[model samples]
Target: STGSATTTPIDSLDDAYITPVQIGTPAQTLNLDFDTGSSDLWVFSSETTASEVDGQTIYTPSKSTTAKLLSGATWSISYGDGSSSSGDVYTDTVSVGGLTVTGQAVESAKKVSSSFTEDSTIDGLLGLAFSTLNTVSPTQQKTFFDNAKASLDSPVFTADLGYHAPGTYNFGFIDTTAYTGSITYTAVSTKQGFWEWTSTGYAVGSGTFKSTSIDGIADTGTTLLYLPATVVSAYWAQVSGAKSSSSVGGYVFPCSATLPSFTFGVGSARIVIPGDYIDFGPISTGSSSCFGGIQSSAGIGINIFGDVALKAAFVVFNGATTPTLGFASK
Candidate 1:
């Protein structure tokens, strides 16, 4: 448990722990990951020649004194598994804690060639998860959460980031101390921008299974929990010694006990997702049984409930109640 309480060991995207900020203007601290499945706020620069940059943290807008660069832009991003990045678009003055969020729409890669330029230490990604997945240039795709959720003193936007947290990108308001029980709310589906739900259908470990077909969105920047290959073969047929071979990679299961609790509901708000995240062990030459957090893209059509299914749910990305997607602990 990486020093548990739910782990957090962020070195520096500007690590005050993790999501710490203070970009440009005598200030230059940045550690961002507010991705709602991609908008744009990448880091790591120094011109990025890209020879497999491992551990990524480049930022050098002349050592940044209010970095700004967006004169006739050209930005590109691709991933379904093609993985790509091309950039040149900037604007700074982005401070997080103590809030000074101004202008802040940044991206400066110059061309990163995948696996995120080797991910040195996250010098990028602060998408804040949805201004309709903000890749910008849809007429500036709603400038960085309409300008950091109205300069966030509290228009409320909280996502505590954990699979292990160490300042792992915190956002303003809504910690409720850390839920001492009783805080469950889910109502915000203004058409589309992921975090979608409407599947009163599907269950493996808790019985009650049925599916007419409906699965979509649900991502926290992906870490494999994708679904719908017939709900992942009915959760690898309740995984007691889960079978389904062919060199087992679509859904393998045999870490012995613990593979039967994959509930899913959204109106009633239930979201189970734990069976050692579906007991996935074996690594190399086929002894099957290995599927930690479900993955079989089916060629990336739809169904990505990443972050191990949003860490079992307690999310609320209220674009001041405009671009809504609220759910809490139900």
Candidate 2:
């Protein structure tokens, strides 16, 4: 069966998008970030300490008749940005976008980092990556999507992220009308349990296309686009008065500065990111300084095509024997 749901941006941050998910028999609705970077469906719940809880909603298994703990099962996960969560597991009926999975593994967080707790609006995270990356101990658990795929019409999902607007994540079927132009396909390297791929080259603004291979992952969980330090420096160099700000933790430029468009290669297909999108809004309101949406991935090892980059294209996360990524102009 086909299923689809709207993913709305969080405030003006546009850092991430959240969709509604129902867990347990009576359906405790929670807004969750559909993260493709990791594999774990964790949520703040009754097990969390009251003091640790912020303004976020909590999932109470006691309220759901079908909720059952897998005795002694536990899970812990950490993100690249240092955010983390640890919890106990429950098997329940999980539903999303009209699709339902029986006895799906749902992790209820007993503890979470400030990064997650502070963001009261995001109730939890729904991992869309390969099941092999699940963090559950003893016997790793499967994600709701993985468990539901068997009953789905196809083994694929599409992420249609919009710029400062609402988007949709379609499950089981590809909606050709959601994107424009022909889709460009690229082979994915799932060794890291990520949608990893290499770009053939890149170009700054209208400048000559540089021939350089860059390895990276398409991560929906991350906010900014991160590339090699050298590449980041090269891009900002073209902007007048742009400099790496120690306080801002990234390159910043004057608000009025003219930014250049960037293009990265997917095989022979070139995906162009508009110049204005790089401005990334001001570091603070009414400030002349603006933080760049693109930054250096020096210590991270892999460059990340986060929301900033992904928003520029229509992406297809194919779940075939040999997984592939399809990109098309939005």
Candidate 3:
């Protein structure tokens, strides 16, 4: 009736988070990124170009007796940074933790970008977003979550992401112990094909809350917290040496510069983001300046409450026929 799995950060940087997923009859285990922002379950596979196959593990459908080709089906998913991966589709037995789902769509990557090849930590991605966003052509497929939903005690999954430590993704239970205080529920606007919502206000550092309607998507796949330029500018202004630089891309600041907390509202509840979280990693090797985790979403046309903000609270992604989102502090 329920399933749970632990997700580990790729490294101390918390740039990418992944969990173990088993595919095929003999159960070939691979570390897969659980991206709530996407709906394509893609992987590095046996058919992938030898040049693109780095040290990461690959999924071979031919090895699994249950695997069947989704003839003439293909998918291509890209990112904001221009990284993309495309492949053919197959269906096979898939399992995570103790839960099992048969005939899950398993996208086998034939081509991948440089970033995908260089990142040895993640072998594939298990998308948790709605199936409507699936990139598959000819025949669209449902996500593992959607397939498992009916059997679950509740049509819900909780994300308890950590700063550097490992976290848990639990299906069918909210786990009250994972968070403090009551969860603040918000109506989700899935028309955009994402778990998007509107916040009531924002505050920089110790400043008082400024009431406004700030809209964004809660994307586990994203690494940073991107907001409107006005809000981002206000936050960076407090940091002595912070400046948006095209050379390094995005805002960077002196490592020693002290930063203030950022606060956002969900109904009457407020979630505070730690200063260090915004002081993303350094720009280059031994560089004194570090990139800012909070950047402007001006060009992207959508604000993203990514891992940086999501990690500060326990999140609930409700995927009932009618969906809603909930947030609670850790």
Candidate 4:
């Protein structure tokens, strides 16, 4: 069966987006972050310690007659930004949009890091990355999409993220009306459990395009755009009042600065991100310092085209053999 769901933004572009999902026989609803960068579906649940729980909702397996523990199974994951969660596993009927998957492995978090606990709105993460990245120990688990794909008309999914607006994700089929212009396809190299690709080059605003090859990953879980230090430095150099601020972290510039647009080459197609979209917002309340959404990717080996970059275009995650990525104007 086909499926589609709306993505809701919370606290601007920094906090990330969430989508509704249902789990178990009685159907316990939860808002999950559809993360393409990782491969583990984990949730805050009754298994979590009372002190570890805050204002967030928790799933109770006892309440769902269909929930069954996957004996001896466990999962743990740590993101590049330091956010982490770990727990035991359960097999239950999980539904996304309207597509249902029987016996989908769901991780029930008993522990979470400060970064994750602080985001009270996120109940869990629905990992869309390849099954190869699944964190389940002893036996790797498949993602909901992976379990449901064989039943779909086509093994594919689409991500349409918006800027402070509602966006939609489609599975099994592409909605032609959601995008304009022909989709430009680029082959993906998923060696690292990510939708990794190499850009031919990039340019600042309307500047001439360069031919520097840059490898990067398409990560919906990440909020900002992170590139090589040299690329970030070059972009910042063009902006007045822009400087690296250790006090505020990353690169900060005057809030009112008129920034130049940024563009990246994906195969023969050019995906352009507007200048205003690159401004991550003020570093502090009433402060003139504003952090840039485009920061250094030196810490991570590859660049990341996060929410700031993905929102600029409609993306297709093609899961057919020899997976590919398609980009189009939204």
Clash count, one per candidate: 21, 0, 0, 0
Off-target runs (Cα >4 Å) in candidate 3 are: none
True-structure lDDT of candidate 4:
0.89
RMSD of 3: 1.0
The 10 consecutive residues of candidate 4 with the worst lDDT sum are 9-18
The Cα local distance difference test for each model comes to 0.58, 0.89, 0.91, 0.89
Model 2 lowest lDDT segment of ten = 143-152
> Of the candidates numbered 2 and 3, which has the greater lDDT value?
3
Candidate 1 residue-pair clash tally: 21
Tell me the lDDT of candidate 3. Answer: 0.91
- lDDT: which candidate is best? 3
Sorted by lDDT (best first), the order is 3, 4, 2, 1
List pairs with backbone clashes in candidate 4: none
What are the per-residue Cα lDDT tens digits for candidate 1 across 184-280? 4544453555555445555878688564445565555666677767777777766666655556455666655576668666555466766664443
Stretches of candidate 4 off by over 4 Å are none
Q: Judged by TM-score relative to the true structure, which candidate is superior, 2 or 3?
A: 3
